[PDB]
Amino acid sequence: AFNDLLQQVGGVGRFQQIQVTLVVLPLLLMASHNTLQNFTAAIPTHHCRPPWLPRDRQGQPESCLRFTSPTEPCTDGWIYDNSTFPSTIVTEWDLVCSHRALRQLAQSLYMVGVLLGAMVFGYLADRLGRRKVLILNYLQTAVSGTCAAFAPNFPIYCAFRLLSGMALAGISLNCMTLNVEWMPIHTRACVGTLIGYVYSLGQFLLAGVAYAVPHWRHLQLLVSAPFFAFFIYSWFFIESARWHSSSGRLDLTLRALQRVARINGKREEGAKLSMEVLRASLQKELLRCPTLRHLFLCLSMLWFATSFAYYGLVMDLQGFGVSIYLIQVIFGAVDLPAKLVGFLVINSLGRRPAQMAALLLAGICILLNGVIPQDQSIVRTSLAVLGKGCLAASFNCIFLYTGELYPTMIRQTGMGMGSTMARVGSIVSPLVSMTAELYPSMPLFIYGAVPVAASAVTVLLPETLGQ
Numbered sequence: 001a002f003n004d005l006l007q008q009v010g011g012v013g014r015f016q017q018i019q020v021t022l023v024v025l026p027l028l029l030m031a032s033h034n035t036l037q038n039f040t041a042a043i044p045t046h047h048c049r050p051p052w053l054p055r056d057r058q059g060q061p062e063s064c065l066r067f068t069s070p071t072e073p074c075t076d077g078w079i080y081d082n083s084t085f086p087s088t089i090v091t092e093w094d095l096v097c098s099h100r101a102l103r104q105l106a107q108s109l110y111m112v113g114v115l116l117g118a119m120v121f122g123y124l125a126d127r128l129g130r131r132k133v134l135i136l137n138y139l140q141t142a143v144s145g146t147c148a149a150f151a152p153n154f155p156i157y158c159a160f161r162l163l164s165g166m167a168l169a170g171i172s173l174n175c176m177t178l179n180v181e182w183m184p185i186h187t188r189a190c191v192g193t194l195i196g197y198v199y200s201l202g203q204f205l206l207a208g209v210a211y212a213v214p215h216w217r218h219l220q221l222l223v224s225a226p227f228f229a230f231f232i233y234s235w236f237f238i239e240s241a242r243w244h245s246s247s248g249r250l251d252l253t254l255r256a257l258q259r260v261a262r263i264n265g266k267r268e269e270g271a272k273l274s275m276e277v278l279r280a281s282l283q284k285e286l287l288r289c290p291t292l293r294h295l296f297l298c299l300s301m302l303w304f305a306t307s308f309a310y311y312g313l314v315m316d317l318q319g320f321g322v323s324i325y326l327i328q329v330i331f332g333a334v335d336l337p338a339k340l341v342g343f344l345v346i347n348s349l350g351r352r353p354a355q356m357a358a359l360l361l362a363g364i365c366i367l368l369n370g371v372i373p374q375d376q377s378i379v380r381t382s383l384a385v386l387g388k389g390c391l392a393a394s395f396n397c398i399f400l401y402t403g404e405l406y407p408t409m410i411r412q413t414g415m416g417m418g419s420t421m422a423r424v425g426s427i428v429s430p431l432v433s434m435t436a437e438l439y440p441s442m443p444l445f446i447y448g449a450v451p452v453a454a455s456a457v458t459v460l461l462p463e464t465l466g467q
Ligand SMILES: CCCc1nc(C(C)(C)O)c(C(=O)O)n1Cc1ccc(-c2ccccc2-c2nnn[nH]2)cc1
Pocket: 034, 114, 172, 176, 192, 193, 195, 196, 197, 199, 307, 395, 396, 399, 418, 419, 420, 422, 423, 426
């Protein structure tokens, strides 16, 4: 068995600690990139440009309509507010009113890239390697991200944000994958938990960076800046030894394991390992099968709906009556208690009842936001914060539940394609937000009605607690 031989060089050790820390380090910036459209594309208060401006029923000047003489649409441009948002992509290329969907199109195009990033670079890691793909993904995001910060017009920004989406998907996919191939079976849950916790710490980093750097060009450049430094040390990564065995390169596998032995200091055991011993140790459809088919759609709907309403709330921080810098801190802050409640309930009640309670409660909070009047800022903000926490507690549960609900043969493929359909939800969520022109609370109603119907799916699943 490979697990027993991985413990020969000491199991978890100095090499394992050093590389896992460096591989998980860019995961802090993963949350910032996924949410960066909130700060780089924030919509400030604006009004038409006189060469004058009607006021709405609320009292503020009516946007994109001006009097012909002291009604006609804006022709000379728009005047924005520099008090809170000095420069965003909305102010730069006039993505207001008529071109309101263009701002959402940036996230949809970016989320198209992250979907194709898992599909393409997932296939590349099987043929090329896990270390080789990581090197080509730390560079790509740094080049694509920086080139996006200097985009001359809008189409160039969308094309260079899509490329950053493809590379970031490869980073996330090859972070957990490369980490588990170099770590023993015993320390497999610690890595899985650490990936999610490091992922949830990125919201705090985004708020701190965006507060000091409000400009969209400087914030985007600074966010993609470390990925050049990550590429500098990404060369010093040891390729997964198990993958080398699967590729018929046992000579490379022996060298990789020997190199680990000297790093951990147990070089005596590494010298014992040899090709004869290495070979002796390592001697060992989803919808096509109705049995797994009726298990796939139920899991797929949970992955889609949980992600569909997640990015329908994280992307819409503005409008709760609180500064977005404070809300981003609070949204990140509610993540840790939400897992604690979920993890305790999961082990005390069951994966299925907890998931249904987490999804149903999350759907109610989102749905009640549209009904509640916008005047009550504190209550409306609190319900959204509670809804965000319950959605996060659903992600942790569905990640655990999916693994236990799949046979060992198809578990790895099911989890990968199960997360793939989750990336599909993050694509449609910005698209649904584009219907806010038809009705103002319609996007919030839809984001709160899909998880409610998704909670009925979990009932059809079989409970796996204590089984
Ligand atoms: C908090 C964001 C949730 C999310 N975003 C994405 C995008 C950016 C579209 O890729 C996906 C996806 O890859 O499908 N997901 C799903 C996800 C589920 C569980 C977890 C998780 C939860 C707890 C502990 C660990 C993890 C985990 N496993 N692998 N990576 N993180 C992380 C992400």
